[PDB]
Each structure stands twice: as structure tokens, then as C-alpha cells.
Amino acid sequence: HPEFLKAGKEPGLQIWRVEKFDLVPVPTNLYGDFFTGDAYVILKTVQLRNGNLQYDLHYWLGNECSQDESGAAAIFTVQLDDYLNGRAVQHREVQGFESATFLGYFKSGLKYKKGGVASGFKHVVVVVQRLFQVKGRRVVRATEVPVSWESFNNGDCFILDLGNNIHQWCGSNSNRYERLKATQVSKGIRDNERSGRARVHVSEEGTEPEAMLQVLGPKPALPAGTEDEDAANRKLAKLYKVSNTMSVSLVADENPFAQGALKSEDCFILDHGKDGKIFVWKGKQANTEERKAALKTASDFITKMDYPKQTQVSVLPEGGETPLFKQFFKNWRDPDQTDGLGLSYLSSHIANVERVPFDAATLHTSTAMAAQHGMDDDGTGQKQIWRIEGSNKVPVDPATYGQFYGGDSYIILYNYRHGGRQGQIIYNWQGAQSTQDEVAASAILTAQLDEELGGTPVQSRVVQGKEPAHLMSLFGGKPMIIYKGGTSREGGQTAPASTRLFQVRANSAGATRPVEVLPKAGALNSNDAFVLKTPSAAYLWVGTGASEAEKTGAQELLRVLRAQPVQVAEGSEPDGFWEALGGKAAYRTSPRLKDKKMDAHPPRLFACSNKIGRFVIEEVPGELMQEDLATDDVMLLDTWDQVFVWVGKDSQEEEKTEALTSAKRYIETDPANRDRRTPITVVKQGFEPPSFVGWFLGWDDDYWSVDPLDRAMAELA
């Protein structure tokens, strides 16, 4: 055996060019260059936290690549996978529409070279005279184009490669951010292709150097940019079951699908084609012919539905499904979950993130711990609570700090200290039964308060029932009691219900919040304790998964209810318990993914926009980096438990005021059917909280002191 032996042995990236049905290694210093007339095979191996190796097999098809060449690359992807015991995730990437995972492997971006093995061009390779058109802001792509002014336009940047002189040219209508990412490609040509020997010359229209003007002739009038992502065709997806010939059978009309719909004896197609990707899921018991023919059937299904030929397709084995595939299902939970160190798959873009458990004594020094637990600090800073009464904020009685009523909406101005510096957080808590005028009034006043405090404070819109972990910790040691629906104003206190049911649950911080729920048995949960104040006896129901903090919260919540507790463990409930709840019922028993939520729902950064009301979101691939936050964009950092809205200083005011709704739109369209009470957190550039910056390793506190572009072209360019 040849190159197969030197494969997934160590963590890293391996690229081969399929050359005459042979896997020829691409020189590593050229990783990122791809000939449009050829096909490549790419293996990314990632080390899991337990030391095991996880494989991602990609094969890449250029625009001018033959059919017998894509087949060759496909055969290798198949036979490489079963050499790795059929546990790899396979990807078919087409030029210009590659998967985010594939795009993450390449920092400096991609280069699409004219030529191929048929044209008689190798990779190894002096005298150079080529031209690249650099289009891209988050996925910088450099396409080789004819060496002519006709190839140009004033919207993008261009690189005139003259061997020992690289000439970067940028149009007048080109944005400063695009110019920045273009210098990366130019620098990459200098350092990787010429080994740092050549000189990179930067210019814009009107300042063309004589060398460039000698090659292209005098500059004529140039046009403008064609300006190229995900829209609202994200929500709907369908699941199919394959037979062989090739026929499919609809098994699930709408997502979220039932995880049990996947049977291990067959293979299934998750159709997300209107969003540009489809999945193939191999059951472990599926026929060997069926498994090896996954890409076979996937391409057929593409044509039988009239999807674009360039549709992303990925192939998953049972047990190694990616988290996006799992999110298409209603509460996907694995047959290991709690036991182990990870899950089905570890997203490469967070594979190098050190996992920091919680310890409040040193929260104030670790941005990473702050981000991984949604904990800006310990919750012990100065704060003000206001209840919204009509059109004004009313100070809440300090004795009742920690109790919130479902018929009110509150504003919580909190002072946080982390590291050496401070910040402020404005929490906007809107009750479920709060009247619409006052809920809307709470939002108006929340924004007004932010401007009073200089526009610097963080804004967080919370909805009753789904409160961030940090919010629970603001009240010292007492729990955050949330009532189903009453008022706290002076002439309006309602009457307590006959029998009430409280779900007391703790965060990673040990703070707890008892949530008053419906008085039904189906509302119970094995991981938390519960409090049932019936007029007869007050029950303290403690689940098998409940710990000290939940008992302490449930106990001390029964304190404020002036009722003696009746300790009752799960499974051994007295008679009166079930009948007070309306009888026995099926509740949730499966444990939660406490520290493995990151593995299940890794944080993703997005760029949101709405040009003509059309909501456009584009995922930025790879490791989360401060460099990826453009000053003229409104970005989205989705941590599952929360959706941050990073607002760039130089973005348009329209997009700035729409920060709340753009996030609300992204959550609404999420194919995972994400809860709409999910807290949204608006954050200003240069005033980001620790729970945000801790996700970005290598965060320069004074990164924006010098303009990013003014630094790059002054650095090594």
C-alpha cells in the first residue's frame, strides 16, 4: 500500500491531488492552491479529548474537472474511509461552494489556479505572470483570471503575480476589510510560494506602478462589483429513506425529526437542499453495497430533485453524526452522553479549546471560564432593579431582590468587575403574562438607559422561564424565585394559587432559580428538585439527579412560602403527591449535557445583514478570532444558551437598531427549532463582556487602537 499508510496517523491536515487515478501529495507549503481542472482528496484528523483520532474526508472538484476525475477522487474517498474502519465523515466540496468545515482548514484562503493534469501542469514547479481576482470577506477566495484590464473591476482587489514582485491592486469601491483579507493572500504568495523572497507592492486605482502598467497597458474605465449565503430557506428540511437503481421514500415531512426515524439497517437522506446541503446517514447494519454507494445515491438524489450540482453533500456514520445533523432532530441524546469525555463528533473549530471547569474564586482572571459558563463574574456587584409600571421605571423594594412576577417586566442595571476593568449589564426581563405595552415599554427604557450610560453597557433581553446563568447569581445566596404571573406594584398584588409547582434548578455557579410551572406531573425533572405547596402539605420532591444546591434552593424557597417541607425522594412518592398533581405521568428523566453542551452545540460566529429585508447570514469558518469581527458589520455569536449580537463601531445605524430583531430572526429561522425565549445579548465593539471575549483565544484588549488595515499593509506587506 502507498500513501494510504501515511494517512490518519497524527493530528493535522493532509492533501493529495488525484493524478491519473493516483494520490499524489500536494507540497504542504502550497496547501490552499487548487487546480480548477483537477480533483483533490483532503484528510483532516483531529485529536479527541480522550486521545482518539477523528477523521474528516473531503474531496474537492474544480470547475473544469472531468467526470472520470471526480469519480477517481470519489473512489479514493470511499476506499480511504473503509481503510479508517468506516468512521470518517465524508465531504464532497465543489469549487466556490465548499463546506464551512473545509473552509476552516485554510487561513489565508483558497487560490483557484488555471490548469490541470490534462492541461499539463504540476504543483511542484521562477518566471511568473498570473493574475488573481480576490473576492471574499469571510471566505477569501482568489481566482486566477486572464492577465488583462478586462479582468478587473473597481469592487474587488487583484494580485498581479510577477514572481519576485507581487502586486496587490485594490479598487476604489473596495471596502477596507476586503483589502485586509486580500493582503493575506498576497503575503501568503510571498511567504509560501516564494519563501519570503519576493516583495509585495500594494496600490490602488490611480497609483499603479510602472511594472504593472507595462504588463497590462494603460488603465481604462473599469466597472463595479458583482457582489457575489443563507437567507430564510433555513427552517424547513425533510428526511428520506433510501432503497438502492435508486428510489427514496419520505419518512419525515417536517423538522425537527424523531431520532428513532433513523434505523440502523438502512441509510437515510436529510434533505436541506433549498439551503444548499444534504446529508447521507449510514446505519451500521446497512448493506455494505449500500454504504459504499452513499455518494452514488447522494448525487442521484441531487439530480432527481433538480438541486444545483454544486450542492454540499456530507456522509455520516451511525454514532459519528455531526452536531448540525443532530440538531435537525427533536432532542438528540446519545447512548453515552454523561459517560465519556465527548460526543459523536468534535467540531474542529473548537477542538483546540482548553476546557475550564467552574471555580468562582478565580472567575475574575479567566475570560475562558467566563465564556464557557455565561458567567461575567460571581454576581456580587452593585445593582438596581426597576419594575416597569406604565411608562416609567420604578425602583423595586430591596427586600424582594430576587423575586420576579410574571405579570411585570423588569430592568436590572448591574455593575460587573472582571480582571482589572469593569463594565455594565442591563438585563431586560419580560414576564410571560406581562401586558404588551409594558413589555414593549421595558424594551424602550432598556435602550434609553444604555444611551444614558454612554452606549457602553451590555444589553440582554431575557424572557420568563429561560434566564441566563449569570442572572441567577445576582442576589447573593438566595434563589431567584420566578412566579407564574402576578404583579409587584402597590395596588395590584394578586391571590396565590391553590396548589402551585416550582422547578428549582441550579446553574454551574451553585445559584438556583425556582420556576413556578403548571401543576402537572409531566412538568417534573429527574435532574432538579421541585416544590409543591398544596394547601394540605408542602412537598420537597428531590430528583435522583438533584444535588445540594437544588435541595438548598427548594428548602429556602419553601422558607419564603411559610410552609413546612415534606421531604420526598424521586421514586418513593407518597400517595397524596400524585393526586395533588392530577395523577402519575411521564416526565423528563434523561440527564442534561452540563459540560458537554459545547460538544453538542459549539459556538458559531455569523455575519447578519438585511439589504432589502432579505435576511442574509453567513457563517465565518474556523477558529473564532477577533480578526473576524469587522468594524462595519453586526455579527452573531451563538453559544446555544444565548445569542450575542456584536455591533461594529462603523456599521450602519439601521443595522445597529435592528440588532435585537436580526438576532430574533436568526433564532426564528434556525432549522433546529430553537426556543424563541432564548436570551439575546447585544454588545458594543470595544466594550465586550468576558462571557463574549473568552470564546476568542488571542484577544487583544487594545486591538482597535490601530486600524486593522493600516497595520497589515504596514506590517509585512
XYZ file of C-alpha atoms in Angstrom, residues 29-693:
665
model
C 3.633 24.953 1.622
C 1.026 25.087 -1.190
C -1.928 23.788 0.870
C -4.746 26.045 -0.333
C -3.856 26.126 -4.023
C -6.167 24.025 -6.188
C -6.184 23.495 -9.947
C -9.628 24.087 -11.450
C -9.088 21.200 -13.868
C -8.310 18.555 -11.236
C -9.735 16.796 -8.196
C -8.143 16.597 -4.750
C -8.582 14.426 -1.655
C -8.257 16.080 1.756
C -7.973 14.278 5.107
C -8.246 16.262 8.344
C -7.525 14.270 11.504
C -8.488 15.769 14.871
C -7.424 14.532 18.301
C -10.339 13.996 20.663
C -10.007 14.943 24.324
C -9.589 11.236 25.149
C -6.708 10.929 22.671
C -8.639 9.157 19.913
C -8.393 10.283 16.294
C -11.396 11.641 14.382
C -11.255 11.818 10.588
C -12.910 14.171 8.093
C -12.590 13.119 4.450
C -13.096 15.794 1.797
C -12.663 15.546 -1.947
C -12.658 18.733 -3.993
C -13.823 19.178 -7.593
C -12.656 22.090 -9.702
C -14.970 23.917 -12.070
C -13.266 22.486 -15.177
C -12.769 18.972 -13.777
C -13.800 15.902 -15.759
C -16.352 13.269 -14.767
C -13.819 10.421 -14.669
C -11.689 12.647 -12.405
C -14.434 13.348 -9.866
C -15.109 9.616 -9.879
C -11.438 8.917 -9.177
C -11.469 11.338 -6.239
C -14.744 9.774 -5.082
C -13.408 6.203 -5.225
C -10.462 7.257 -3.060
C -12.724 8.977 -0.518
C -14.695 5.722 -0.309
C -11.703 3.385 -0.023
C -9.823 5.725 2.324
C -12.820 5.744 4.667
C -13.068 1.963 4.989
C -9.300 1.856 5.478
C -10.043 4.004 8.550
C -12.733 1.473 9.594
C -15.638 3.471 8.150
C -15.730 6.054 10.950
C -14.834 9.181 8.971
C -17.213 11.945 7.921
C -17.047 12.323 4.140
C -17.481 15.647 2.331
C -17.949 16.420 -1.365
C -16.843 20.018 -1.932
C -17.245 21.823 -5.256
C -15.206 24.870 -6.250
C -16.768 28.041 -4.868
C -19.351 26.394 -2.591
C -17.207 24.424 -0.139
C -18.395 23.462 3.330
C -17.588 25.666 6.309
C -15.528 22.821 7.789
C -13.418 22.590 4.625
C -13.052 26.377 4.509
C -11.853 26.382 8.117
C -8.739 24.376 7.232
C -7.381 27.298 5.177
C -6.493 30.531 6.970
C -5.051 32.585 4.100
C -7.914 31.408 1.865
C -8.115 29.467 -1.372
C -6.470 30.003 -4.749
C -8.081 28.548 -7.884
C -5.331 28.098 -10.472
C -5.988 27.770 -14.186
C -4.779 24.402 -15.438
C -4.765 20.747 -14.516
C -3.096 17.417 -15.144
C -4.763 17.217 -18.562
C -3.514 20.713 -19.426
C -0.043 19.525 -18.388
C 0.551 21.424 -15.148
C 2.011 20.108 -11.894
C 2.060 21.640 -8.416
C 5.773 21.325 -7.623
C 7.082 23.938 -10.099
C 10.619 31.107 -11.287
C 9.159 33.195 -14.160
C 5.538 34.027 -13.191
C 2.904 36.288 -14.790
C -0.552 35.394 -13.436
C -3.473 37.448 -12.132
C -5.858 36.694 -9.261
C -9.264 38.199 -8.515
C -9.660 38.280 -4.730
C -13.348 38.113 -3.821
C -14.357 37.428 -0.244
C -14.783 38.938 3.215
C -15.053 35.891 5.492
C -14.211 33.192 2.907
C -11.434 34.886 0.923
C -11.227 33.211 -2.499
C -8.589 34.141 -5.096
C -9.496 33.012 -8.619
C -6.902 33.008 -11.389
C -8.111 35.239 -14.226
C -6.777 36.370 -17.613
C -3.962 38.907 -17.352
C -5.926 41.868 -18.712
C -7.640 45.050 -17.573
C -10.898 43.433 -18.724
C -10.484 41.003 -15.820
C -10.562 43.982 -13.445
C -13.338 45.931 -11.724
C -13.444 48.600 -9.037
C -15.247 46.454 -6.461
C -12.629 43.838 -5.578
C -8.869 43.559 -5.145
C -6.457 41.936 -7.588
C -2.995 40.403 -7.286
C -0.669 40.686 -10.291
C 1.843 37.917 -9.604
C 5.193 38.745 -11.233
C 7.326 36.150 -9.454
C 9.768 38.240 -7.423
C 7.236 41.105 -7.266
C 3.679 40.581 -6.026
C 1.418 43.490 -6.987
C -1.748 43.896 -4.921
C -4.230 46.276 -6.557
C -7.494 47.303 -4.897
C -10.396 49.135 -6.499
C -11.837 52.425 -5.323
C -15.186 50.832 -4.387
C -13.397 48.141 -2.340
C -14.018 48.056 1.406
C -11.160 48.351 3.898
C -11.918 44.902 5.325
C -11.734 43.218 1.913
C -8.386 44.917 1.281
C -7.169 43.435 4.576
C -8.057 39.834 3.719
C -6.566 40.366 0.255
C -3.183 41.277 1.763
C -3.273 37.877 3.476
C -3.389 36.132 0.093
C -0.596 38.355 -1.233
C 1.519 37.731 1.871
C 0.765 34.022 1.543
C 2.093 34.032 -2.017
C 5.222 35.803 -0.767
C 5.933 33.542 2.213
C 4.697 30.136 0.997
C 5.315 30.184 -2.768
C 8.489 32.313 -2.841
C 9.761 31.568 0.698
C 9.627 35.213 1.788
C 11.936 36.258 -1.036
C 9.626 38.435 -3.130
C 8.369 41.965 -2.467
C 4.633 42.619 -2.106
C 3.658 46.008 -3.550
C 0.272 47.429 -2.542
C -1.519 50.002 -4.684
C -4.998 51.182 -5.630
C -6.513 52.644 -8.788
C -4.567 55.674 -9.991
C -1.331 54.607 -8.261
C -0.466 51.657 -10.494
C 3.305 51.019 -10.591
C 5.150 51.164 -13.896
C 5.788 47.409 -13.814
C 2.057 46.691 -13.586
C 1.226 49.292 -16.241
C 3.888 47.816 -18.527
C 2.194 44.403 -18.395
C -1.489 45.386 -18.572
C -1.098 48.566 -20.627
C -2.779 51.833 -19.657
C -5.755 51.631 -17.339
C -9.165 52.229 -18.962
C -12.531 52.817 -17.328
C -13.463 49.929 -15.057
C -16.940 48.746 -13.975
C -18.164 47.853 -10.474
C -18.556 44.692 -8.418
C -21.000 41.826 -8.976
C -21.139 41.403 -5.139
C -21.409 37.591 -5.045
C -25.232 32.988 1.589
C -28.026 31.749 3.858
C -31.386 33.516 3.791
C -34.714 32.255 5.225
C -34.771 28.878 3.446
C -33.061 27.554 6.589
C -36.037 26.327 8.609
C -37.572 23.539 6.531
C -35.884 20.195 5.868
C -37.119 16.696 5.054
C -35.831 13.205 5.831
C -35.861 10.362 3.292
C -35.073 6.644 3.357
C -33.090 5.085 0.508
C -33.670 1.685 -1.099
C -30.909 1.074 -3.670
C -31.417 1.710 -9.301
C -32.218 4.366 -6.689
C -35.523 5.280 -5.050
C -36.290 7.280 -1.914
C -39.257 7.263 0.458
C -40.367 10.241 2.536
C -40.069 9.292 6.205
C -40.373 12.740 7.866
C -42.260 15.664 6.327
C -41.097 18.388 8.732
C -38.201 19.026 11.123
C -37.485 18.524 13.976
C -37.466 14.816 13.122
C -37.752 11.909 15.527
C -34.319 10.426 16.195
C -35.976 6.998 16.152
C -36.892 7.542 12.499
C -33.281 6.661 11.683
C -32.986 2.871 11.637
C -29.544 1.269 11.599
C -30.431 -1.302 8.918
C -30.958 1.372 6.237
C -29.496 4.658 5.023
C -31.319 7.984 5.044
C -31.104 11.340 3.278
C -31.568 14.531 5.277
C -32.664 16.985 2.583
C -31.692 20.607 3.259
C -31.219 21.314 -0.426
C -33.059 24.634 -0.543
C -30.337 25.740 1.899
C -27.626 24.076 -0.190
C -26.661 20.885 1.653
C -27.897 17.304 2.018
C -26.821 14.576 4.434
C -26.440 10.826 3.980
C -26.635 8.781 7.191
C -25.238 5.235 7.107
C -26.725 2.732 9.508
C -24.162 0.349 10.961
C -26.316 -2.598 9.843
C -26.823 -1.213 6.326
C -25.662 -3.391 3.440
C -22.004 -2.974 2.506
C -23.054 -2.223 -1.077
C -25.395 0.484 0.227
C -22.713 2.084 2.408
C -20.004 2.281 -0.265
C -22.602 3.700 -2.684
C -23.551 6.638 -0.442
C -22.013 9.264 -2.729
C -23.500 7.245 -5.601
C -27.068 7.766 -4.367
C -26.452 11.267 -2.986
C -25.579 12.656 -6.421
C -28.623 10.949 -7.952
C -30.949 12.426 -5.310
C -29.423 15.806 -6.188
C -30.433 15.401 -9.836
C -33.822 13.796 -9.100
C -34.803 16.941 -7.152
C -33.209 19.462 -9.564
C -30.824 20.799 -6.951
C -27.707 22.710 -8.034
C -24.912 20.305 -8.948
C -22.640 22.160 -6.501
C -24.833 21.296 -3.502
C -22.793 20.359 -0.444
C -23.178 16.694 0.465
C -21.701 15.048 3.555
C -21.869 11.422 4.672
C -22.152 10.387 8.322
C -21.787 7.027 10.096
C -24.114 5.949 12.881
C -22.579 7.227 16.107
C -20.338 9.827 14.472
C -23.010 12.274 13.360
C -22.076 15.950 13.257
C -23.892 18.296 15.671
C -25.759 20.079 12.856
C -27.224 16.785 11.638
C -28.220 16.029 15.234
C -29.833 19.451 15.711
C -32.295 18.551 12.932
C -33.875 16.130 15.437
C -36.089 16.682 18.481
C -33.656 16.391 21.417
C -30.998 14.097 20.024
C -29.446 12.321 23.007
C -26.752 9.680 22.613
C -26.472 6.262 24.308
C -23.482 7.512 26.309
C -23.916 11.263 26.966
C -22.901 11.577 30.622
C -20.256 8.843 30.446
C -17.179 9.689 28.380
C -15.350 12.888 27.504
C -17.050 13.980 24.270
C -19.933 13.073 21.972
C -20.488 11.783 18.435
C -18.159 14.410 16.990
C -15.863 17.271 17.993
C -16.130 20.361 15.795
C -12.579 21.080 14.662
C -13.034 24.842 15.135
C -13.212 24.335 18.936
C -11.043 21.216 19.117
C -8.123 23.284 20.454
C -10.154 24.998 23.200
C -8.987 24.121 26.703
C -11.999 23.196 28.830
C -12.088 25.212 32.066
C -14.435 23.968 34.822
C -16.099 26.487 37.095
C -14.466 27.790 40.248
C -15.813 31.139 41.421
C -12.689 32.028 43.414
C -10.717 32.588 40.178
C -13.523 33.537 37.786
C -12.154 37.099 37.670
C -8.917 36.005 35.936
C -10.145 33.600 33.219
C -12.053 35.007 30.265
C -12.310 31.404 29.050
C -14.214 30.323 32.166
C -16.461 33.380 31.861
C -17.398 32.476 28.286
C -17.779 28.718 28.800
C -20.282 29.244 31.645
C -22.015 32.516 30.724
C -20.610 33.990 33.949
C -19.217 37.520 33.673
C -18.457 37.425 37.414
C -19.871 35.989 40.652
C -22.932 38.255 40.737
C -21.842 40.284 43.778
C -21.593 43.760 42.233
C -23.788 46.799 42.709
C -27.176 46.623 41.018
C -30.513 48.392 40.668
C -33.829 46.665 39.937
C -36.712 48.520 38.294
C -40.242 47.333 37.649
C -41.981 48.740 34.580
C -45.224 50.454 35.631
C -46.810 52.021 32.566
C -44.142 54.236 31.005
C -41.586 54.679 33.814
C -39.102 52.564 35.733
C -39.989 52.123 39.410
C -37.340 51.104 41.982
C -38.044 47.637 43.353
C -38.152 47.196 47.127
C -34.631 45.983 48.051
C -36.109 43.400 50.435
C -37.585 41.476 47.478
C -34.452 41.458 45.297
C -34.558 38.020 43.680
C -38.332 37.666 43.248
C -39.889 38.381 39.850
C -43.556 38.282 38.854
C -44.827 37.014 35.514
C -47.189 39.953 35.111
C -44.364 42.502 35.286
C -41.276 43.406 33.292
C -38.064 44.490 34.991
C -34.793 46.250 34.215
C -31.652 45.208 36.102
C -28.652 47.534 35.855
C -25.674 45.516 37.103
C -22.038 46.509 37.689
C -19.586 43.723 36.825
C -15.860 43.553 37.607
C -13.660 41.009 35.826
C -9.896 41.134 35.639
C -8.981 44.732 36.310
C -11.642 46.514 34.274
C -15.391 46.988 34.735
C -18.475 47.031 32.579
C -22.229 47.222 32.916
C -25.070 44.864 32.022
C -28.698 45.891 31.547
C -30.986 42.877 31.911
C -34.475 43.276 30.428
C -36.702 40.591 31.964
C -40.158 40.387 30.366
C -42.782 38.301 32.132
C -44.901 35.810 30.227
C -48.183 37.369 31.403
C -46.863 40.940 31.284
C -49.135 43.151 29.194
C -47.735 44.005 25.781
C -47.491 47.769 26.329
C -45.290 47.393 29.408
C -43.149 44.663 27.824
C -42.558 46.992 24.884
C -42.043 49.862 27.339
C -39.366 47.811 29.104
C -37.518 47.486 25.791
C -37.698 51.222 25.033
C -36.412 52.098 28.505
C -33.678 49.443 28.317
C -32.242 51.125 25.221
C -32.741 54.598 26.707
C -30.761 53.580 29.797
C -27.924 52.301 27.602
C -27.599 55.714 25.948
C -27.673 57.429 29.350
C -24.670 55.300 30.364
C -22.797 56.177 27.164
C -23.929 53.317 24.932
C -21.250 51.136 26.583
C -23.380 48.782 28.757
C -24.281 45.299 27.596
C -27.976 44.785 26.822
C -29.616 41.407 27.456
C -33.262 40.619 26.682
C -34.471 37.825 28.975
C -37.867 36.117 28.838
C -39.581 34.381 31.762
C -38.512 30.750 32.084
C -35.243 30.942 30.104
C -32.907 33.070 32.204
C -29.137 33.198 31.633
C -26.944 31.503 34.211
C -25.300 34.787 35.229
C -28.647 36.402 36.062
C -29.448 33.832 38.770
C -26.271 34.723 40.695
C -27.034 38.420 41.290
C -28.779 38.010 44.661
C -26.039 36.742 46.956
C -27.124 33.316 48.150
C -30.910 33.406 47.950
C -32.574 31.825 44.896
C -34.177 33.724 42.025
C -37.868 32.964 42.521
C -39.943 33.361 39.345
C -43.712 33.415 39.830
C -46.035 32.243 37.068
C -47.927 35.519 36.790
C -48.594 38.201 39.374
C -47.845 41.880 39.961
C -45.449 43.511 42.410
C -46.854 47.049 42.169
C -48.532 48.614 45.153
C -52.197 48.401 44.198
C -52.328 45.095 42.355
C -51.000 42.162 44.392
C -52.991 39.104 43.325
C -54.068 35.975 45.243
C -51.823 32.895 45.405
C -52.985 29.809 43.551
C -54.496 26.796 45.307
C -51.706 24.309 44.550
C -48.520 25.559 42.884
C -45.492 23.743 41.474
C -41.935 25.115 41.446
C -38.994 23.821 39.392
C -35.864 24.682 41.382
C -32.743 24.309 39.227
C -29.145 25.389 39.793
C -26.513 26.623 37.359
C -22.825 25.707 37.241
C -22.351 28.512 39.804
C -24.455 26.948 42.562
C -27.047 29.709 42.310
C -30.589 28.438 41.870
C -33.906 29.622 40.473
C -37.283 28.078 41.385
C -39.558 28.413 38.348
C -43.284 28.169 39.037
C -44.714 25.764 36.441
C -48.099 24.191 35.755
C -49.247 21.829 38.500
C -48.901 18.655 36.441
C -46.724 15.582 36.835
C -45.377 15.909 33.283
C -43.531 19.059 34.410
C -41.169 17.154 36.717
C -37.482 16.577 36.013
C -35.113 13.992 37.478
C -32.144 16.399 37.493
C -33.738 19.114 39.651
C -35.704 19.267 42.861
C -39.274 20.551 42.997
C -41.530 22.348 45.466
C -45.264 21.588 45.624
C -47.138 23.832 48.072
C -50.553 22.303 48.306
C -52.972 23.578 50.996
C -52.506 20.228 52.777
C -48.742 19.599 52.907
C -45.787 21.285 51.205
C -43.769 18.712 49.254
C -39.999 18.835 48.749
C -39.564 16.479 45.793
C -35.865 15.781 45.168
C -34.802 14.058 41.974
C -32.131 11.412 41.675
C -30.009 13.914 39.753
C -30.650 16.793 42.149
C -27.722 17.839 44.329
C -27.036 20.076 47.329
C -27.745 23.418 45.644
C -31.178 22.318 44.415
C -32.178 20.988 47.841
C -30.889 24.209 49.416
C -32.861 26.319 46.949
C -36.008 24.209 47.278
C -35.652 24.259 51.068
C -35.100 28.023 51.235
C -37.846 28.677 48.677
C -40.207 26.782 50.975
C -38.935 29.282 53.550
C -40.462 32.252 51.721
C -43.658 30.221 51.208
C -44.073 29.953 55.027
C -44.704 26.215 54.722
C -43.055 23.289 56.483
C -41.361 20.957 53.969
C -42.181 17.296 53.415
C -39.035 15.615 52.109
C -39.839 13.190 49.281
C -37.251 11.447 47.108
C -37.937 10.532 43.489
C -39.449 7.069 43.071
C -40.726 6.951 46.659
C -43.570 9.460 46.484
C -46.460 9.227 48.972
C -49.981 8.850 47.649
C -51.023 12.472 48.119
C -48.228 13.692 45.852
C -49.518 12.253 42.583
C -53.208 13.025 43.146
C -52.419 16.650 44.016
C -50.656 16.855 40.637
C -53.518 15.146 38.788
C -52.063 11.624 38.805
C -48.953 9.917 37.516
C -47.456 11.000 34.205
C -44.339 10.600 32.087
C -41.780 13.346 32.737
C -38.209 14.001 31.633
C -35.614 11.602 33.055
C -32.670 11.824 30.647
C -29.765 13.788 32.187
C -28.695 17.134 30.769
C -25.472 17.921 28.909
C -23.846 20.111 31.553
C -20.203 20.383 30.471
C -20.780 18.656 27.108
C -23.136 21.338 25.760
C -20.131 22.840 23.969
C -19.581 19.493 22.245
C -23.280 19.245 21.355
C -23.722 22.914 20.376
C -20.355 24.541 19.695
C -20.333 28.336 19.438
C -20.719 29.671 15.913
C -19.998 33.169 14.650
C -22.242 34.626 11.949
C -22.498 37.843 9.955
C -26.052 39.179 9.727
C -27.410 41.652 7.177
C -30.689 42.731 5.569
C -30.289 44.687 2.338
C -33.887 44.561 1.063
C -35.435 42.994 4.150
C -33.925 39.737 2.854
C -32.094 38.475 5.944
C -28.614 37.270 4.942
C -26.496 35.339 7.448
C -23.072 33.939 6.558
C -21.127 31.650 8.876
C -17.452 32.555 9.306
C -15.486 29.273 9.386
C -12.619 28.119 11.546
C -11.378 29.086 14.973
C -13.169 32.064 16.492
C -10.796 35.000 16.096
C -11.001 38.682 16.991
C -9.796 39.465 13.458
C -13.134 38.152 12.118
C -15.151 40.996 13.729
C -15.295 43.676 11.045
C -15.937 47.169 12.389
C -18.692 47.754 9.796
C -20.636 44.534 10.466
C -23.174 43.304 13.003
C -22.033 39.819 13.992
C -23.757 36.945 15.784
C -22.002 34.676 18.292
C -24.404 31.813 19.036
C -23.465 29.899 22.202
C -26.763 27.907 22.242
C -27.733 29.099 25.739
C -27.535 32.650 24.379
C -27.046 34.608 21.138
C -24.601 37.501 21.309
C -25.000 40.419 18.910
C -21.647 42.089 18.293
C -22.218 45.561 16.830
C -19.308 47.052 14.933
C -18.428 50.677 15.579
C -18.544 51.574 11.875
C -21.663 49.635 10.865
C -24.757 51.416 9.578
C -27.204 52.813 12.128
C -30.080 50.843 10.576
C -28.325 47.540 11.269
C -27.430 48.847 14.735
C -31.019 49.461 15.857
C -32.100 46.169 14.237
C -29.663 44.197 16.421
C -32.475 42.707 18.511
C -34.683 41.687 15.580
C -31.824 40.379 13.420
C -30.887 38.032 16.255
C -34.573 37.212 16.767
C -34.754 36.462 13.034
C -31.727 34.143 13.114
C -33.186 32.192 16.044
C -36.613 32.076 14.381
C -35.217 30.626 11.137
C -32.820 28.189 12.837
C -33.559 24.689 11.456
C -33.003 23.250 14.950
C -36.346 24.811 16.013
C -34.613 26.934 18.618
C -36.573 28.329 21.558
C -37.673 31.913 20.898
C -37.353 32.833 24.585
C -33.620 32.279 24.053
C -31.844 35.282 25.623
C -30.306 37.796 23.220
C -27.290 39.857 24.298
C -26.331 42.998 22.373
C -22.685 44.002 22.788
C -20.763 47.049 21.576
C -17.357 46.914 19.910
C -14.504 47.553 22.320
C -16.878 47.082 25.276
C -17.413 43.332 25.026
C -18.032 41.371 28.241
C -15.867 38.460 29.427
C -18.549 35.895 28.541
C -18.026 37.078 24.936
C -14.268 37.632 24.602
